[PDB]
Amino acid sequence: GITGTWYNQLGSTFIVTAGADGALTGTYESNAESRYVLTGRYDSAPATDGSGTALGWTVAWKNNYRNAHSATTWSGQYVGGAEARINTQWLLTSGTTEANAWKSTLVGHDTFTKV
Amino acid sequence: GITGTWYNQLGSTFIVTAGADGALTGTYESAVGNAESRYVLTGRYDSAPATDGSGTALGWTVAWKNNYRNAHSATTWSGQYVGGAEARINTQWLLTSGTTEANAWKSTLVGHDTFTKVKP
Amino acid sequence: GITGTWYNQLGSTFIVTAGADGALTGTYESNAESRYVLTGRYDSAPATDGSGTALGWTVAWKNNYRNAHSATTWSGQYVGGAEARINTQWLLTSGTTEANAWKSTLVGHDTFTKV
Amino acid sequence: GITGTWYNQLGSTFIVTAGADGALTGTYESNAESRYVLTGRYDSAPATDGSGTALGWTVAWKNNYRNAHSATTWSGQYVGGAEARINTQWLLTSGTTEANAWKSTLVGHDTFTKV
């Protein structure tokens, strides 16, 4: 259910492959200058009680064309069915001086669908 | 650099290699939770940081499944590496477990971890 | 506009009053047994550029009938519009021993409406 | 144990009174130009088994002198003993337009002591 293309409400698109040994690999896009590498892990043997599938991934916003000196991690779960969804919470950290560290990390949430 | 052996305040061990391409790969060995032995990790970092004395942004994930156990959960650390006399990595983390829908409101824990190359 | 009766996605109900110099007061519910006191603050003089109104509140989960030994804080903003709404992120801390402190705090998000 | 003056490691002070009813009230000193009102709640009947006492508070960053159009909430626990402390996680939310609501909320942590 996870392998494929997922869309968020803000435009963003991501293409993942879920490997047989819990690897997640792919790209995150919004054109070439907006494409970034992703890598992650997921539970390759979830429960059967109807629970969701735990997963996580990271993006560092540096590519061949620009560098924001920042990285985002998403933590969440995959819910299959007709309205398959991935529900997440995320953290985005910027590199800062020690003086500015207190304001280095944003938090939020995202929901991704297959359509 | 980031490449090396790291320890957190709880005696957890993080062995990591930083690739020239911004890739992070390694093994995590925990001190707390449903955990035994090493788990695989993967992440990304900024391979061309600011020169201004800023930190190096980075992040990684562990899914808590190995050949010994499975806790149906994953943790993501997001933070920065600061070099210097005392090198450390400062992170915030999120831990999400699989849950039914009725219980998803309590599926995520939040916390912070500090890693150093010296074991406490 | 902030004064009134609000509802979240899960069926919970919160009645508040916004005071003249930024005080928030009221009760949260989900039967008297499930009724709890809330207190907080808001920006009593927001910007005029279209920005929302920042606020926060706290509830400790103890009343005359029940005590979970825990507390939640909500941090967010009020937005006036077609549907006035308050979007929040929240933190819930449980009293734990020091060995269990690493797992004492949950994070989530909630959206309230007058409907 | 909670009533009193508390310090963090970045030059911030707060003075709090803990009421019999579970009320927290006081002032947060980030010069009167820098003093802001605080309000919160705490568990007025904790466990005696070594657990900390759950609590939370809010400061909206407006006083009679300045206004940052934002609010911080602290969620954590009080731990007594010779080295008493209050361990917290916080969220700071700023007023933003809808277009910038993804970047409205910062997350962090802080530890307060009696000295």
GROMACS .gro file of C-alpha atoms in nm, chain A residues 91, chain B residues 6-14 28-32 58 60 64 75-80 88-94 110-116, chain C residues 102, chain D residues 89 109:
model
   41
   91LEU     CA    1   0.983   1.868   1.285
  121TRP     CA    2   2.782   0.871   1.973
  122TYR     CA    3   2.614   0.829   2.311
  123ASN     CA    4   2.305   0.996   2.451
  124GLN     CA    5   2.228   1.102   2.803
  125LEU     CA    6   2.065   0.761   2.866
  126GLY     CA    7   2.355   0.544   2.749
  127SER     CA    8   2.208   0.467   2.408
  128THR     CA    9   2.462   0.415   2.127
  129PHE     CA   10   2.450   0.558   1.774
  143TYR     CA   11   2.121   0.242   1.695
  144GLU     CA   12   2.138   0.056   2.025
  145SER     CA   13   1.890   0.172   2.289
  146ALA     CA   14   1.894   0.180   2.668
  147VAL     CA   15   1.514   0.213   2.717
  173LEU     CA   16   2.039   1.670   1.011
  175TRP     CA   17   1.728   1.021   1.089
  179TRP     CA   18   1.181  -0.067   1.607
  190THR     CA   19   1.126   0.736   1.598
  191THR     CA   20   1.256   1.037   1.402
  192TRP     CA   21   1.528   1.268   1.535
  193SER     CA   22   1.565   1.618   1.388
  194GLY     CA   23   1.849   1.845   1.502
  195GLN     CA   24   2.192   1.990   1.437
  203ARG     CA   25   2.751   1.744   2.033
  204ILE     CA   26   2.431   1.676   1.838
  205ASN     CA   27   2.114   1.840   1.973
  206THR     CA   28   1.785   1.685   1.872
  207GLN     CA   29   1.412   1.684   1.915
  208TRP     CA   30   1.233   1.358   1.840
  209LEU     CA   31   0.891   1.216   1.767
  225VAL     CA   32   0.769   1.402   2.189
  226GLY     CA   33   1.107   1.457   2.357
  227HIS     CA   34   1.469   1.573   2.320
  228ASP     CA   35   1.808   1.401   2.312
  229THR     CA   36   2.167   1.521   2.329
  230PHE     CA   37   2.453   1.311   2.189
  231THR     CA   38   2.823   1.337   2.264
  337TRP     CA   39   1.137   1.014   2.844
  439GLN     CA   40   0.845   2.122   2.676
  459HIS     CA   41   1.237   2.257   2.598
   0.00000   0.00000   0.00000
